[PDB]
Each structure stands twice: as structure tokens, then as C-alpha cells.
Design a protein around this ligand. Sequence first.
Ligand SMILES: N[C@H]1CCC[C@H](Nc2cccc(-c3n[nH]c4cnc(-c5cccnc5)cc34)n2)C1
Length: 273
Amino acid sequence: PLESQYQVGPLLGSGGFGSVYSGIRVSDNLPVAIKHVEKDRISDWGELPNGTRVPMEVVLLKKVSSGFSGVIRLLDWFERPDSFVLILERPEPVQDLFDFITERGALQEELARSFFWQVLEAVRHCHNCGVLHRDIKDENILIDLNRGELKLIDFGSGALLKDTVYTDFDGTRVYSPPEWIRYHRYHGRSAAVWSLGILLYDMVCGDIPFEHDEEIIRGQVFFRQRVSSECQHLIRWCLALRPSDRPTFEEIQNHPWMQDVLLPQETAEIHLH
Ligand SMILES: N[C@H]1CCC[C@H](Nc2cccc(-c3n[nH]c4cnc(-c5cccnc5)cc34)n2)C1
């Protein structure tokens, strides 16, 4: 019975992903997040190592949950008649990147550098564990306001990482690559890099670069804020129209703009405290 193991708090939010509540594990008072997703709303299903029907999200989460905490870890999960309930780690105090950007405006490049680097590390961790997130965006990353550490959330649109083409997509369209818009086909890593380009622009400009399909397809970036030439270059590289023209993750992290990143703690002391 999960109803007695957890003290349910306020609704943190709801949307396509379902409904997520703040919670507290009664045994040790550990802060937690409680996510409800209706079975009717789940189209992507997977198999547990012990042979059982579970949402793919659970499968993916299990594969990425462990030491490296760039990703919010799954602590436990329950099946109900018409829904699944996930119990997830919850940092405190916390704010998602979307709200942070909204309230603070465009981020100083030193801050964006640290945040972007942490996201890259988190995404690399996922890929190394055979998991593709498919919905990297500011709304899906949490900021531990005390430690300056970022955490990736919501694998409800994710999939197992593969080297062949994806022909399905239920992520955020304005973060999706031109090859999806045009051909309904994309490969995991190169598509991820595109979304990262969108994210980086978002960090240093205060808003997303594209709104309509035609803009994504044209792939022309204009800067509304003062942004260094190095940063502009990295962004334009990630947003290359041709997937094969985009940088690998190693290439991104070796880019000149990516050098001399602050540690999470230093980042918090300077920018969050
Ligand atoms: N864009 C917003 C929409 C509302 C959910 C979320 N906000 C917060 C706020 C504090 C903690 C967590 C939190 N702590 N731990 C978590 C684990 N998973 C999720 C989550 C969010 C969305 C979809 N799936 C899972 C959220 C959390 N999430 C992000």
C-alpha cells in the first residue's frame, strides 16, 4: 500500500506526462515526487527483466537509476487498476529551468556554461545506459538551488537507444529536428544534439529560437541578446540542418565555449546564493 508509505503533498504540476505531486516517505521523511500516469494514456510499453508488463518509462528509469545523479532516480513504483504510480527522488529546494529562465531572463554565459555542461553529462549518462530521453528542454530539467546541480526528468517520451531510424516521436515539436518535421525520421544522438542546440539558445537568449515548422526547416538563427561568437558558433553547429553536420557529444564538450566550466558548487555560490 503506497497510500500509507507516503504523505502526499501539493500538486507540483500536470500535463501530457500526467500528474506529479510533492511527497514525503514516511519511514525517513525523504522528500519525494509522486507521478501518476493513466494506462489509457500509455502507448509505449516495455518488459521488466523478470517478465512483466510495465510502461517503457519505468524500464528506462531503471536503466539510468544509480550513482550518477544527473538524472532524477526512480525509487519505487506501483500498479493500480487504471494507472501507474512512480515514486521519484525530489531535490529541495528546487526550481525547473523554465521558471528559472523566465524569472531571471537570459542567463549569463558563465552560468549557462555550467548548466549546459551538466545537462550534457546527464544526457551522456542516459545514452551510456542505453536510454534516449527524446524530450530535452528547460521544463524537463530541475535545478537544485542549494547545490547548483541540474537533474533530468520525465522519460515518458523516451525510448531504448538504437542505431537505426526512429519513425515515432511524442516529444516537444519546437525542440524536434528538421528531419522529423520533413521526413518523420531521425536518429537518436543527432536529434538529441539538435534539441540541445535549442536548449542552449534558450539559456542565453531567454527564449526558444523557433516557433513554426517553416522556421525549424529554414534553420536560421537570430540572436536577440548579446551572445559571444563562440557560443553562437556552438549553437549554430548543434542546429545544423543536416544531422551529419552536427557535433558529437565529445565535440560539443571540447568546443572552445565549453572550456573552464565551473563545478556545480562554485556555480551555486556565485550565481544562486
Ligand atoms: N515543468 C515542471 C512541471 C511540474 C513538475 C516539475 N516540477 C517539479 C517541481 C519540484 C520537483 C519536481 C520533481 N522532483 N522529482 C521529480 C521527478 N519527476 C518529475 C516529472 C516531471 C514531469 C514529468 N515526469 C516527471 C518531477 C520531479 N518537479 C517540472
